[PDB]
Amino acid sequence: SKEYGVTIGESRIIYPLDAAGVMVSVKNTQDYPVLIQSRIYDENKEPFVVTPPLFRLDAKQQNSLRIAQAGGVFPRDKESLKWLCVKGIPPKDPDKDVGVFVQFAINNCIKLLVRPNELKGTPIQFAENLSWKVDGGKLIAENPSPFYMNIGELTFGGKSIPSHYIPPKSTWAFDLPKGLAGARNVSWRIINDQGGLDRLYSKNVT
């Protein structure tokens, strides 16, 4: 067996817009040293600086990364979403058969939620305000709040739906597995700012 693991000390970063920086811990949970390669991507999967961008982290050790905003311009009436990806790069390493040798590396990615000070409250204050419709074969969540509604559990007609975030002041369309005909109740829970599953809300679709 080959074993790999990378732990980031939080499951999301709430980055107060225009703050100088935040620290996040990364932990090499393995028995060999790794290189820790840290990168930020925009919401599309592809201003913020992560220091150090590459460094060695010995077996079982933990270090801190600093995420710093240097300039850039963000809307103030909603959160913005970026992604911080932390990759653990492990060390590198018959006239009749095909021998197969594969090395992996984990790239652990978490949401970097840029939050204007101008917004009032937090997502758990508004989690109940999601509304739901079925249209064009899909279940549609509308989020009137200025926060990403980071759904962590979603059930429609008693069937689990793979969650995804609902962007602020906008919507998200979820695919429906078979046999949901005439389903009515949607129950969901968001993930709070600290990564925990929040309380359960329920409503019927329109």
Partner: protein, 149 residues
């Protein structure tokens, strides 16, 4: 005699993002009489863990240098660039086939919630579209990217 004061304070508890991967090698691969390898061989078994319940199969992406959507490509080490492809598949709780993204696309099944605790994926051989695989050592270096909810 008695004097008092009071205050109400808050503690913050966080859930980190922990990801693990265990890879258990499969059997060596025999070249058959006509020179092909067999399809659907268990090349190895990947167990992804540490993730929070609710994490989905579309949030997991296995990538490599060849970047062939839906496949991981293994390449000889002998300079001749013999290749074969494999797929990455697992089972959901109903025993239907599912797959994580491989080089950005899903080969099979709908998006599903990963099994609680950990999820097994199987690397299974497809074939070579080149034909004529030589005996030898074949490698790939695969990044598993998990986009935490």
């Amino acid at each position: 005699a008695d004097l008092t004061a009071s205050t109400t304070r808050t503690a913050t508890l966080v859930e980190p993002a922990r990801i693990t991967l265990t890879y258990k090698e499969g059997a060596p691969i025999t070249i058959m009489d006509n020179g092909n390898i067999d399809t659907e061989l268990l090349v190895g078994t990947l167990t992804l863990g540490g993730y929070k319940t609710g994490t989905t199969s579309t949030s997991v992406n296995f990538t490599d240098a060849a970047g062939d959507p839906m496949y991981l490509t293994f390449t000889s080490q002998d300079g001749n660039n013999h290749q074969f492809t494999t797929k990455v598949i697992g089972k959901d709780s109903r025993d239907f086939d599912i797959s994580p993204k491989v080089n950005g696309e899903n080969l099979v099944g709908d998006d599903v919630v990963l099994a609680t605790g950990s999820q097994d994926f199987f690397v299974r051989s497809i074939g070579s579209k080149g034909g004529k695989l030589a005996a030898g050592k074949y490698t790939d270096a695969v990044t598993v990217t998990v986009s935490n909810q």
